[PDB]
């Protein structure tokens, strides 16, 4: 995406184009939490054992 | 098939057709005829 900041998209692009950038940022940030939580779930299985 | 259907009827300059398409800008796209962000439908235009 064109920026790491949400408003630096919105104050530049318009509705259908911000929707393209912001879906790149959502897809990757959601992937970042699915990764963090997967790490913590594997790491939880250690601290349990 | 369709739940309800409408035919919105008007006349414009031949160049302003690009402005009718959903998610545009220009006076026609901004001050007189705006199609929504999910416009399910068709734009039909011809020099008359």
UniProtKB/Swiss-Prot annotation, chain A:
The chain holds residues 972 to 1020 of 1273 of the full protein. It comes from Severe acute respiratory syndrome coronavirus 2 (2019-nCoV). This is Spike protein S2'. Subunit of the fusion protein that is processed upon entry into the host cell. Mediates fusion of the virion and cellular membranes by functioning as a class I viral fusion protein. Contains a viral fusion peptide that is unmasked after S2 cleavage. This cleavage can occur at the cell membrane by host TMPRSS2 or during endocytosis by host CSTL. In either case, this triggers an extensive and irreversible conformational change that leads to fusion of the viral envelope with the cellular cytoplasmic membrane, releasing viral genomic RNA into the host cell cytoplasm. The gene is S.
């Amino acid at each position: 995406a064109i920026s790491s900041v949400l408003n630096d998209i919105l104050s530049r692009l318009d509705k259908v184009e911000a929707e393209v950038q912001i879906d790149r940022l959502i897809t990757g940030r959601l992937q970042s939490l699915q990764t963090y939580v997967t790490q913590q779930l594997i790491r939880a299985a250690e601290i349990r054992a | 098939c369709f739940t309800n259907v409408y035919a919105d009827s008007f006349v414009i300059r031949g160049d302003e057709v690009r402005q009718i398409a959903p998610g545009q800008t220009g006076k026609i796209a901004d001050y007189n005829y705006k199609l929504p962000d999910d416009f399910t439908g068709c734009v039909i235009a011809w020099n008359s």
